[PDB]
């Protein structure tokens, strides 16, 4: 299913495609936001009568969506959170046109026994919804952030990458009588820069910065208290990608210690889709970028990539905007943004 | 900075591929697994396209074909595909007095020979020659070099 | 109205039609007779025929497992609490619809299962579970990249079986024993496991060990699978290491003997923690941590 | 196998050594062939028992049938001339052709 | 003359020798007929014999540890600087008094070191070694009160066997899986073991299930222990968890060929690391921490 | 409580520049008064002292560097018997946390003889010094020991004249003062 139907309708599908490939788009936020812009040019100009058609329709679209482009994930999300909020209000519609309904609590067996018309407005208000819920993540979680790390203990940090990590690390040192001291991994071949300008910037909020060269977190790992993953895209059995390398070997280590991690992220980057693989999903960055030389260079293939993957083992808690959700719960979380045929394109 | 025309030398370099190039143009022919003209397409875009053309020559009937399929023939792109159709035979000179005939030139215009297609953003390269341009009015056009592994061998 | 034929019947029948299958339909056919409309006479008769089922029962908790659904089941039914036939009609109905469903759930298997397959990894199939046979068959029909490997169980020879099943296939195939299973840490590149049971969170029941591979694939991080259909869904939590209903006994240091009278005993019957597994295969969706659990909650109330 | 690439629709049947290759549109890499730094074009396709060398260029419709051994830097003629080594069946060791 | 008829016949009875011991006495034996004066003609013949010896194996390891250990002996005896005759008449002697001292060692590992099963500790063992055999009858003698617990070895149905030598003494037994390993470690103590070999690294060379065993007493932290004979350093490293020289093939991955066949080839031999020897029962004293290591460096004198 | 450890640690503390702190665990039965006076002559010298309840050691040992003992009786495999109170614990505690041990032994205070069974070793202890008056002991049963082993699963330096030795190697120095013919006689 490519583009065909679409006539003087809907344009920046190719716009939104470009976005995505060459790279003019950057953070998950701006993604996000273009696809929240989409939604909202897709609400105000497509053709509705029929609501089953409709909903094929959006999936149809959100199959496209996902041929496009797979590392994009909040896009996804957003996408299947309003379909979502559809289909509660189609189901109350459905509820009326029938016109028994609830017996005590949400209950199971659903699957097994049997279960003019308006709702633009609903849907336009699903999208204002999922807009407040991106709005500020560390605006929710710094509550229950200062409430961990304490006086004298030792922080290690891995992934500057993610935006809200930092901001979570100066909503932690904004005291003045508790002291602690950090510890910084580099990530080489992918986050060098952006540890450089962390550390600077830790330097220039008045606290105690160490620098980590990558190989020498084995000779300091007696000291270490707490382990925080830059993560940018959660999963279905708690699982996450995180931002860019140079995170699954420190928690590998900090397993084998038996050594506090903690997973910081928001859930709009929770996805309702399995990863199946970490293949499909994790992608490679470039091999240039390591070493120079091109034509003697064709025996000398080098391998370097961008993105992690976590297991589902090393995690153990996600404190959200919401609150403390954890690895073998975060399902039902899931449940409660994305429904049961939503999954599904 | 912006509305640019792309016109692009093709159906040229023909008989340069030692055996091949004969019956159907040099640039319909299957590069990585998938023809070679989208890449140099994609690029163009990337670079600033605003519309298409190409100054096909070797049996027209084909390339009309391949723009019939292509994804640049419909409403839908910025920029269509209407390749210019000359008398058969003639070298790069010949081709630029056939343009020059046909009339549609304009004043920043793109001039690429033969087929392309690299990573390095363009953009910056359009804003430099820009700001070339501001400086004095008789500057030219623009080369691309690149550097390569100290020492020369495979040239 | 007789179940004891019914259990006679069937045991080593399955792969067109799964056991408990049967043993529901059985169920539900005796539950068509004496009307589930008058509770006062139809409960108690289900609570006898489950009792009967139990005394029939040796080595399982399975068929208890499907009658306790099935019970739920019937339970969720009547509320609608308006026009008392309908109900009643689709009770009827629900028996033979529910070996429908198996189809479905397999089809469903076939298409959100299929996706894990990756460049090079060797599978190893644990137990006997007909819906892990399906999904492999199907991964087979696809032709990813995979290794099909059987082992050397021992009930009543079922790995030898499962061995020569996979023979009719074509698939080139090598053996594991249950004590030279420790040498596989990373070769072997993912653990499977069918299930013969699923109970509240991460509990299930199969056959003579799962709970030391468990614990073998946590040592080596190794990624280790539950693989079923749909039918097995329980209400159980045990205490100790391994606790369950047992005929074959637990350490039974058998009496002096010179000329071999009875010896064959042990821990015939294995459960698996919620920590060791990492993936739950289940045709509803796609569903791992924790929600069958969260399911039995919804269900039960209790 | 080693570092070389394989087309679209290139049907395999078994036991072939390949290393740093490039194949292009419909080629039958055929029982027991050699592809060393050689390329094969579109509907041109291999046999049984050929050993190809380094530079072997292939164009249209050569239809490599039945025993050959071509030598490195070899060039083989393509459209439907100039070039030894023609279009029609066996590439040539033992001339064929018109 | 050979060795190997020497070996041949040595067969039903045993029990009683102990490795190189009855090896060592035969290749004594082999020395003291062609002239044991010189040595240009008979050390390197000897080497040779060893070397045609090893040839020959069909599925036996400790027998080229036994010749080292001789040549150390031979090494160790011409250093007196006096005469050739009393030196050589030394030689000839010690064989018959190396197996003599092997009894004796075997008497004191029977009386001296056993108490690691005294106050009801029940032994988990497995691997059909005589000095394990010894210890425990030797136990019943004693009195000192015990419990046994075996796995079931059926690759070529030893446990049977085991089972029976355990009827003569007329104590109560259990039979235990190796896929159920993980479901009994509640009631028996620790883990105990008859091996063929033990490893320049530290490990042991054993039969077919043994990393996963140990796996499980690391996870339960009861302390895994080795019983043997101790001259059966086999000069071997194990430089991997699974990389050894080896009897057959390293998990044979078979082909889809025929019906019910190419499966039965089980990896009957196996290996765990070198960090699990808490002590190891030998007859120059118990001595273990490192003491394989130790004796291999006095060996070598590096 | 012995005069080498104390000997030890007054060493350590004239050099007061390295920054050393002094958890001190009381020890439920006998160790209390010696405690307190290895206290009393740290205060003599001015050396800070802080004072360990015996129950507190899961909430205390993620924060612990360094462990010394001054214990008694050293053996084979790498084990020690210390001179009395909860040791066994903490260090389970230190193995599951990982933590490093240090040992001040000497030598001659280790034995050639080598423990074997848990059941025989561990020497249980008075109930004198627990539970005033015996009417209560009919129908309860209180179980007491004094002084404990230590497994080698844990400890990893002994700090001795000579030098430090891995407890997995400290036979071999056993030896290089002691025989195998005097044990068994």
Known sequence: ?345 | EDRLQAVVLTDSYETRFMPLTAVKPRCLLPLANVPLIEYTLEFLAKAGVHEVFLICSSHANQINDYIENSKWNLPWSPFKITTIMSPEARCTGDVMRDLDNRGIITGDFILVSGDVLTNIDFSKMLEFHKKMHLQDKDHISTMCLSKASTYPKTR | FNITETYLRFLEEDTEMTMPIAAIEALVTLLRIKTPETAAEMINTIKSSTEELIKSIPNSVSLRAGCDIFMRFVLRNLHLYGDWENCKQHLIENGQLFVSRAKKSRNKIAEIGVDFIADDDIILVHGYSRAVFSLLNHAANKFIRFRCVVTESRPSKQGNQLYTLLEQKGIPVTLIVDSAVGAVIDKVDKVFVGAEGVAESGGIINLVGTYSVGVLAHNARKPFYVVTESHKFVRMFPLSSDDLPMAGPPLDFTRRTDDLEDALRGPTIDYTAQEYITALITDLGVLTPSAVSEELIKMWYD | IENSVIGRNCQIGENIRIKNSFIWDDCIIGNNSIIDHSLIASNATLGSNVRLNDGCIIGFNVKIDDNMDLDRNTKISASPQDLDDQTLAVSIVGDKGV
């Open chain 1, 1 to 345: 299913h490519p583009n065909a139907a679409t006539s003087d309708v809907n344009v920046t599908i190719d716009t939104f495609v470009a976005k995505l490939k060459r790279r003019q788009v950057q953070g998950s936020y701006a993604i996000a936001l273009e696809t929240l812009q989409l939604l909202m040019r897709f609400i105000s100009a497509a053709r509705w009568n029929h609501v089953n058609d409709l909903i094929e329709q959006i999936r149809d679209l959100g199959n496209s969506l996902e041929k496009a482009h797979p590392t994009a994930f909040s896009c996804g999300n957003v996408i299947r959170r309003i379909l979502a909020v559809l289909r509660d209000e189609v189901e109350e519609d459905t509820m009326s046109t029938t016109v028994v309904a609830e017996p005590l609590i949400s209950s199971m067996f659903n699957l097994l026994q049997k279960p003019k018309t308006d709702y633009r407005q609903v849907a336009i208000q699903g999208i204002k919804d999922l807009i407040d819920e991106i709005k500020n993540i560390d605006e929710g979680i710094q509550q229950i952030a200062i409430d961990l790390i304490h006086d004298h203990e030792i922080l290690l940090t891995p992934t500057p990458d993610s935006k809200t990590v930092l901001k979570f690390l100066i909503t932690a040192r904004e005291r003045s009588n508790r002291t602690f001291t950090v510890l910084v991994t580099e990530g080489f071949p992918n986050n060098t820069k952006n540890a450089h300008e962390f550390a600077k910037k830790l330097a220039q909020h008045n606290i105690e910065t160490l620098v980590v060269p990558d190989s020498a977190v084995f000779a300091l790992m007696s000291r270490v208290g707490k382990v925080i993953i830059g993560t940018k895209a959660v999963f279905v059995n708690g699982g996450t990608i995180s931002s860019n390398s140079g995170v699954s070997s420190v928690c590998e280590c900090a397993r084998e210690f038996r050594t506090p991690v903690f997973a910081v992220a928001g859930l709009y980057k929770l996805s309702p889709l399995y990863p199946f693989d970490v293949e499909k999903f994790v992608e490679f960055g470039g091999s240039q970028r390591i070493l120079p030389r091109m034509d003697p260079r064709k025996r000398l293939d080098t391998v370097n990539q961008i993105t992690d993957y976590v297991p589902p083992e090393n995690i153990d808690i996600y404190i959200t905007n919401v609150g403390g959700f954890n690895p073998s719960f975060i399902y039902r979380i899931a449940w409660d943004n994305y429904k049961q045929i939503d999954v599904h394109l």
